[PDB]
Amino acid sequence: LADLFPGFGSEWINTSSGRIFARVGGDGPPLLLLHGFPQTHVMWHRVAPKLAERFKVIVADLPGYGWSDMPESDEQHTPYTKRAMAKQLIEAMEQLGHVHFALAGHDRGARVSYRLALDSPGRLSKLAVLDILPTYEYWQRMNRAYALKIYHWSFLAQPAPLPENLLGGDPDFYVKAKLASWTRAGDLSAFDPRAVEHYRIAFADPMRRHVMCEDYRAGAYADFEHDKIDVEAGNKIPVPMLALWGASGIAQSAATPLDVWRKWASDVQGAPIESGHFLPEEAPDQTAEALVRFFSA
Amino acid sequence: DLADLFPGFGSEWINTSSGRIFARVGGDGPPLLLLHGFPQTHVMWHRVAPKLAERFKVIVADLPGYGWSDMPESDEQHTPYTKRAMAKQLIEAMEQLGHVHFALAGHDRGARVSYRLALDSPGRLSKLAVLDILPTYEYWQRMNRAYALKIYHWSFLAQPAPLPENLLGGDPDFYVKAKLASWTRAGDLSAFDPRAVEHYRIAFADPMRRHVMCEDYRAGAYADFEHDKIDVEAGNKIPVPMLALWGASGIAQSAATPLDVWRKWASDVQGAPIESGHFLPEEAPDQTAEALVRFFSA
Ligand SMILES: [Ca+2]
């Protein structure tokens, strides 16, 4: 497995819920980058060096993902709720002395991120979310067209071991299908093959796949419930936030992303990028520049 | 190895322009076509077909592409697995038997064939029974978080090939037993005859059978939806007397009544809950049989 962050350190951050793996590089204000599904921290390998010019970049595997420990889940998928993940990552950042930091998340990590910003906004200077809407919004908009486009939201949320048993027949196919289908090009050409190897190898572990399902089960239940309470109480993210989304990505398919986020965030700017879902690998320069600009403000 | 679950029924291979329909046929009297759904075969009727054969010529057919029926080759629009095309094929199959006016009961996918047949060709039907469904249009219009989770397979199996095919191949035995068990009231396989499960298991073991089922669900997401949509917008209603049976623990039920939904689609519809999960004819064979013979004799 290639090192795609030459010059970055490697940290195993112990937390009460298990170790967080993270590549660490650069200097300046702390910036935490959170990947999503079905990826690992290495998805930032094209934009993290550019950010590392200006920030201490911390590129963490989510709890349960990549090389991070996998907290044992429970009946309510608690450790893989974005609330628990946010808590664990806050803990991890505290081990490094970062009690106030900037945060950019993509996909699942973007969901940890806005949930972190709702639960503990004092921890965040600025927040960027990449190609998501709040979990609540996906579910609330889940009509026929959207059920087809993000079927995996309901499929992977099916009770164990149904998704796990189907994914275990040919894990490589599924991780590759999900990577391909949500690029602008519809293939694996936007990805560095050494990165795909990271994704493929992470997905080959049956425990890692279970965790991903647990994350999706949390996404269907507790994460939705947590979001529901906030949107029905009018709790908005008070942290300055950037919402970046792909013109060909998931977030824009069932809503205008900046309109949705303005319901969720008191101070949100948005920009589309010509890209599928995987902004940091499909459009690395345009993404890194959007992030450098936002976080330098 | 595969039990004969219809003692006294013969076996017909009915030729159509689109391939052979397999059927068990038994009884005498007015013709009654029984249509199974997913992921079963005609043998799902094995507990109620003998009851019905008392008063009817009961034709228990595998849907096109299911069980032992031939699998017409699909196309880009999944046309042979649209309910319209399946209904046309079964209308032709019934014509081969000299049945141009018949009673029809369908469950699950077969119930979708059945109301689409009733919409397209109402003159072919004396009466229609649909077990544990709402029209495809209604499932998709009610698509929300809760329903998306419960009938996830409607969007999963409609994914472009070969995505569901490949995943189904990951553990087909588990998948078919899971689908069977998860939609029963008990939550396990105890309601099913083990010889029936082996039929469903063995049908599900063929990758081409599984592909056809995905084509069926792809049609269910696209063409089938569009065909239903047209009838909704045109105010077309099913004019055949209709019986809607649903499981109290079934898919069709939710918060609003299935019968209230079917009244938007049919002019003359009666409806009963049956203490059952999805698989009324196996979980509740006597109550299902009784409701069907009483409705179909009129
Ligand atoms: Ca297995």
Numbering used by the authors:
A (entry chain A): 4 to 300
B (entry chain B): 3 to 300
Text lifted from the article:
Here, we describe a high-throughput approach to serial oscillation crystallography. Using the silicon microchip technology with fast translation that has proven to be useful for serial collection of still data from crystals at XFELs and synchrotrons, we have found that adding oscillation to crystal data collection dramatically decreases the number of crystals needed to generate a complete dataset, compared with still data collection. We tested three different protein crystals for this study: FAcD, lysozyme and CO-SWMb. The high-throughput, fixed-target serial oscillation crystallography method described here is a practical, fast and economical means to collect high-quality room-temperature diffraction data with minimized background scattering.
Since different crystals and different chips were used for these datasets, we performed a further test by independently processing the first 1° data and last 1° data from crystals of Chip 2. It was found that 394 and 428 datasets were required to give a complete dataset from the first 1° and last 1° of crystals from Chip 2, respectively. Of the 294 crystals used for the refinement of the 3° dataset, 164 (56%) and 181 (62%) of those were used in the refinement of the first 1° and last 1° datasets, respectively, and 127 were used in all three cases. To probe the effects of radiation damage, we reprocessed data from the 3° FAcD dataset (Chip 2) and the 5° CO-MbCO dataset. FAcD lacks any moieties such as disulfides that are especially prone to site-specific radiation damage so we expected that any radiation damage occurring would be stochastic in nature. We compared the first 1° and last 1° datasets from Chip 2, processed. There is negligible difference in the processing statistics and Wilson B factors for the two datasets. When the two structures were overlaid and compared using GESAMT, they were found to have a high correlation and a low root-mean-square deviation (RMSD) of 0.072 Å indicating little to no geometric distortion as a result of radiation damage, in agreement with an experiment described previously.
